Amino acid sequence: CHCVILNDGNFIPVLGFGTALPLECPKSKAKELTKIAIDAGFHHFDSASVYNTEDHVGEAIRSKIADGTVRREDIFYTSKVWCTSLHPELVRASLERSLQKLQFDYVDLYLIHYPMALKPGEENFPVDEHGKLIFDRVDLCATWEAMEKCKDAGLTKSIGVSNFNYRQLEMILNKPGLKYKPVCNQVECHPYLNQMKLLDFCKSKDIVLVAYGVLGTGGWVDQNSPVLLDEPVLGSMAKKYNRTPALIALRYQLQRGIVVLNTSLKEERIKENMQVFEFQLSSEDMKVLDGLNRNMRYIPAAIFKGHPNWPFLDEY
Amino acid sequence: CHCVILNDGNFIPVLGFGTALPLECPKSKAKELTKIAIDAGFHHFDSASVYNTEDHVGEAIRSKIADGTVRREDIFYTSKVWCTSLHPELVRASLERSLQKLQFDYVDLYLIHYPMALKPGEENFPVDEHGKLIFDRVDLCATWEAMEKCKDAGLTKSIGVSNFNYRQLEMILNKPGLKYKPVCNQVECHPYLNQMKLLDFCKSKDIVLVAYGVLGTQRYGGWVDQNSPVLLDEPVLGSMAKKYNRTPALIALRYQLQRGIVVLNTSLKEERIKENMQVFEFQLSSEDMKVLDGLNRNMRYIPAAIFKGHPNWPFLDEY
């Protein structure tokens, strides 16, 4: 493995495969993609209870274990508790359900998906008659204590968070009687939103930053206007190193000590990910990439914008 | 043709097929889709110079004219001049280039795509080293006069605008020496953004409101936002669909037709393409129309965000 140590003693592969699927795709597509990713060399798989793809991803993994491609111990599986189960007593319940769907005995990492609670229930997006989310309030420190207990019960080897801004991380870190610090903070990160300040903070607290939406992500204008991968600097550097604009973006994060999660529906693209270990960017080129930062948040989770705990209002 | 009259005497089919394709589709996809629509009964096709599918669309259309399925005069084709060619002297050149690709003698409708100009050039989204769109200053009244000439030259039968707000329409309507009022204003419109005020304004000025994004849109590619409830998930639409034994989509389409709006819709699915024609097989009661009116929440799914900093960005005013 091309791994990095977590503050709790566990190791996580620096390259992971995201299992979230496009709205149009049959959830079963996750199974095929997971198998392809495994054959391509991926050992780290990122999922979440809300993606409703865990049963298929679990089947893919158990199938590659059964034919001897990999062993459970060599796989790093991550799940996340959704907004509707942040209530302390619902945390463990959701994790156990995921393990049931996966037919696993444990997950390697369990994260709080967002620092925002929503009305408990089967619906992942509970809304009123006006289509507005029914927010709920919870003590994130209580939710955290429940995460700690899951780790102690052996249901998850490590625990961390996702989409937490620095102050929210602080709430957990300064929590009285804290037992386990989150091992990571999974957030959107790429050349247009390099998360420099948040990264420096996490590193200062021995927390690993895990990036999703590393290559970026409606109407014709909004769908055809230039996006991250259209960046001329990446295209130029890609030709300079004879790789792809995507590989430049992926490599950029690795050289910053960031764990990267990537996804694709195409086998060739999934396989190309492994090239991120085949080359290196020069200090000067790393500095050039640092200059692309333009605070462009592609995954704002707009529907939550009115939530008291929306993490993206603060600078970082 | 289920057609309605325009303020210039010409008629437009009340249902049209948009020819804009998802960035992940070979531009040729537009040819097969257009032929399918034509067989399904579509006569109205909405395109734009920027979509860069005009050649493929013209191929399909001419193909159906050749085999006798339709006549050129039975087809209503719309094109639009992009932000980079709004300068009075570039308006006609853009149209002639589109006709060349289509291999058409004329287009039935020609529109100003957005009331915002961008740096001239082949590049459609010119940006600086900071990734910011390079805006340009233009006189829309002068642009409009260039559109009027196109109509006088017979290159387009009618002229209109798209994504203009009420004051921007006024700018044109109150123009000294105005020869032709725009026949329409093509804007985003659906139950969550019914454009009541802009509609009432257009009606008062004899302007037809043409709607796109009629079934909602999901701009954000992020999982959470793409997986949160969408317009078609609306319980009122699902409940009403059951009442009339139709689909939530058909209810949303019929809603617009009864308001005097011309609807544009698209789909990569042949089955959904056909389904559209069902909108003409039923009618919504006046009571239910009122019910649908209550669904408005000023939810604009197509904000053209990249343009948000432009002086003429049309979505700032109330309407």
Side-chain angles (χ1 to χ4, degrees):
Chain A
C1 175
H2 276 292
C3 275
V4 70
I5 191 79
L6 295 176
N7 65 46
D8 71 349
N10 282 295
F11 297 80
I12 183 175
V14 301
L15 173 68
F17 188 70
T19 62
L21 289 173
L23 188 60
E24 315 70 62
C25 292
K27 293 305 172 65
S28 63
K29 224 293 189 290
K31 181 180 178 185
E32 167 181 43
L33 297 179
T34 295
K35 288 187 181 184
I36 293 175
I38 289 180
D39 286 341
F42 278 83
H43 290 96
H44 177 177
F45 292 85
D46 189 83
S47 193
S49 71
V50 76
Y51 302 157
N52 289 83
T53 58
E54 291 190 292
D55 55 321
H56 293 116
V57 174
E59 187 187 4
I61 296 175
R62 292 184 287 90
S63 174
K64 288 294 177 172
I65 284 176
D67 65 21
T69 302
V70 302
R71 295 178 304 145
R72 174 69 187 90
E73 26 285 302
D74 296 311
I75 289 297
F76 188 104
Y77 180 85
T78 296
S79 188
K80 321 189 182 80
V81 56
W82 186 240
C83 305
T84 57
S85 293
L86 294 193
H87 270 27
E89 79 279 9
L90 299 181
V91 175
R92 176 162 185 157
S94 181
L95 173 49
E96 272 177 32
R97 186 68 172 68
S98 284
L99 290 172
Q100 288 171 23
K101 296 179 188 176
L102 293 157
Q103 292 181 35
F104 279 9
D105 300 314
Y106 72 93
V107 298
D108 299 83
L109 182 62
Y110 197 47
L111 320 163
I112 287 173
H113 209 148
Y114 280 92
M116 306 172 284
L118 291 176
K119 174 192 178 69
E122 290 185 59
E123 289 300 303
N124 294 315
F125 297 85
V127 297
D128 53 35
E129 45 295 311
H130 307 291
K132 312 200 73 175
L133 286 177
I134 304 173
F135 310 144
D136 187 16
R137 79 164 177 294
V138 177
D139 177 3
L140 302 180
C141 283
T143 302
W144 190 249
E145 283 169 357
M147 293 291 281
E148 296 183 317
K149 292 182 181 60
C150 290
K151 175 174 164 67
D152 280 320
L155 297 172
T156 178
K157 296 182 69 187
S158 299
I159 52 177
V161 301
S162 179
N163 306 122
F164 271 48
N165 56 38
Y166 109 78
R167 291 179 175 72
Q168 300 174 320
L169 275 185
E170 283 290 59
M171 274 162 58
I172 298 183
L173 294 174
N174 305 326
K175 172 187 171 300
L178 175 61
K179 189 173 182 182
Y180 306 119
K181 296 161 63 172
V183 301
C184 69
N185 184 14
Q186 181 178 132
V187 298
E188 176 182 357
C189 194
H190 53 263
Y192 285 175
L193 187 84
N194 66 33
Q195 303 276 193
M196 178 184 78
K197 288 186 187 299
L198 184 56
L199 176 65
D200 290 330
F201 175 75
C202 290
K203 291 180 64 188
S204 80
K205 302 303 183 185
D206 192 26
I207 297 173
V208 177
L209 189 161
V210 178
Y212 64 87
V214 298
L215 308 182
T217 59
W220 192 86
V221 171
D222 294 309
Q223 200 186 313
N224 291 277
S225 57
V227 285
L228 185 59
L229 284 181
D230 297 313
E231 173 58 54
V233 168
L234 296 181
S236 174
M237 211 168 278
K239 291 178 182 175
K240 170 176 180 173
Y241 290 80
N242 196 285
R243 297 291 175 175
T244 64
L247 279 169
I248 302 302
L250 288 171
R251 184 62 200 188
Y252 172 63
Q253 305 290 32
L254 278 203
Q255 276 181 47
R256 298 174 72 207
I258 292 170
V259 166
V260 305
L261 297 178
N262 194 199
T263 66
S264 181
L265 300 170
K266 306 301 293 295
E267 180 162 9
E268 35 279 291
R269 293 297 165 283
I270 297 177
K271 286 181 294 184
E272 293 189 0
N273 282 290
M274 295 305 144
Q275 280 182 49
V276 69
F277 298 117
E278 285 172 40
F279 69 111
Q280 307 168 187
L281 301 173
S282 61
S283 295
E284 184 169 359
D285 286 323
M286 280 301 288
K287 294 186 183 306
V288 175
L289 297 174
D290 283 336
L292 294 178
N293 190 53
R294 52 195 63 178
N295 275 57
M296 176 60 248
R297 192 175 293 281
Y298 294 110
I299 306 172
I303 191 175
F304 286 90
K305 210 170 199 303
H307 196 292
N309 284 51
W310 193 64
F312 312 133
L313 200 175
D314 299 359
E315 164 173 32
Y316 74 102
Chain B
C1 162
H2 309 78
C3 277
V4 294
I5 193 171
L6 298 173
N7 65 42
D8 74 339
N10 285 303
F11 289 78
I12 182 173
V14 302
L15 178 60
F17 188 79
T19 61
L21 292 179
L23 227 189
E24 56 276 66
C25 285
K27 289 299 185 297
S28 62
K29 229 294 183 180
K31 184 179 180 181
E32 62 182 64
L33 294 174
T34 304
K35 281 192 292 182
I36 293 173
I38 291 181
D39 288 319
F42 275 83
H43 293 281
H44 178 178
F45 294 81
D46 181 271
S47 194
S49 66
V50 84
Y51 294 164
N52 197 56
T53 60
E54 295 191 292
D55 41 6
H56 295 285
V57 175
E59 205 164 79
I61 294 175
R62 289 185 289 94
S63 182
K64 292 296 175 180
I65 292 180
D67 59 39
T69 304
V70 297
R71 296 173 305 181
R72 175 64 185 85
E73 54 265 59
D74 299 306
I75 296 296
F76 186 104
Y77 181 92
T78 299
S79 184
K80 312 183 183 83
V81 55
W82 186 237
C83 304
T84 56
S85 292
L86 297 186
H87 280 319
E89 68 279 55
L90 299 181
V91 176
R92 187 166 180 172
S94 191
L95 174 55
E96 294 179 305
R97 184 172 188 175
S98 291
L99 290 174
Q100 177 170 62
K101 292 185 176 179
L102 296 156
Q103 301 199 190
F104 276 26
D105 294 344
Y106 69 81
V107 295
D108 300 75
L109 179 60
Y110 194 38
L111 314 173
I112 293 177
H113 210 153
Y114 279 95
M116 307 169 282
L118 295 180
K119 174 181 184 178
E122 183 182 299
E123 182 156 50
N124 291 320
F125 293 87
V127 302
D128 59 33
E129 348 76 59
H130 311 299
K132 291 184 178 180
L133 274 179
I134 304 174
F135 310 138
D136 195 32
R137 284 173 49 265
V138 75
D139 193 304
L140 295 178
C141 285
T143 300
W144 186 252
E145 300 183 309
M147 295 288 287
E148 296 181 309
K149 289 176 176 53
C150 285
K151 173 173 167 58
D152 290 313
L155 295 171
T156 175
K157 296 186 61 185
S158 304
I159 54 177
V161 299
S162 189
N163 308 117
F164 271 48
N165 54 38
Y166 125 69
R167 292 190 181 66
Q168 291 174 314
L169 280 174
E170 285 283 72
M171 203 184 293
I172 302 294
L173 300 171
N174 300 167
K175 188 185 77 67
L178 175 67
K179 190 165 186 175
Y180 304 116
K181 306 162 67 176
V183 301
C184 68
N185 182 21
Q186 179 177 136
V187 301
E188 174 186 354
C189 190
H190 51 264
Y192 290 163
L193 182 80
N194 67 33
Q195 305 270 193
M196 204 70 84
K197 290 191 175 187
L198 183 58
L199 173 63
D200 289 329
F201 173 76
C202 288
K203 289 176 55 180
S204 72
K205 301 301 174 184
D206 264 59
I207 298 178
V208 169
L209 187 163
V210 178
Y212 64 80
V214 304
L215 303 182
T217 312
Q218 296 167 289
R219 175 183 54 167
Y220 295 134
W223 192 88
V224 172
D225 279 312
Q226 73 177 304
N227 286 273
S228 60
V230 298
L231 165 59
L232 291 182
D233 283 318
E234 173 55 51
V236 170
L237 294 177
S239 174
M240 210 174 273
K242 282 185 178 180
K243 177 181 179 182
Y244 294 80
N245 232 73
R246 300 295 173 175
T247 65
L250 287 173
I251 297 295
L253 297 178
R254 186 72 204 187
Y255 169 64
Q256 305 291 39
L257 292 187
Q258 276 172 49
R259 301 173 77 213
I261 298 165
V262 170
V263 295
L264 297 183
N265 198 26
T266 65
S267 182
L268 295 181
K269 333 302 179 183
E270 170 164 40
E271 303 186 69
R272 300 306 163 184
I273 302 303
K274 302 177 183 173
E275 179 183 301
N276 288 296
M277 297 305 292
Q278 270 188 59
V279 70
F280 297 113
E281 310 181 320
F282 71 103
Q283 293 176 49
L284 295 169
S285 67
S286 61
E287 293 70 44
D288 287 334
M289 285 298 292
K290 302 300 98 63
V291 171
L292 297 177
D293 288 323
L295 290 177
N296 185 68
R297 57 205 55 181
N298 182 50
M299 176 65 117
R300 190 180 297 285
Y301 295 121
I302 310 181
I306 196 71
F307 285 94
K308 199 159 184 175
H310 193 297
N312 304 315
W313 195 60
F315 311 133
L316 240 176
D317 303 349
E318 173 179 49
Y319 69 103

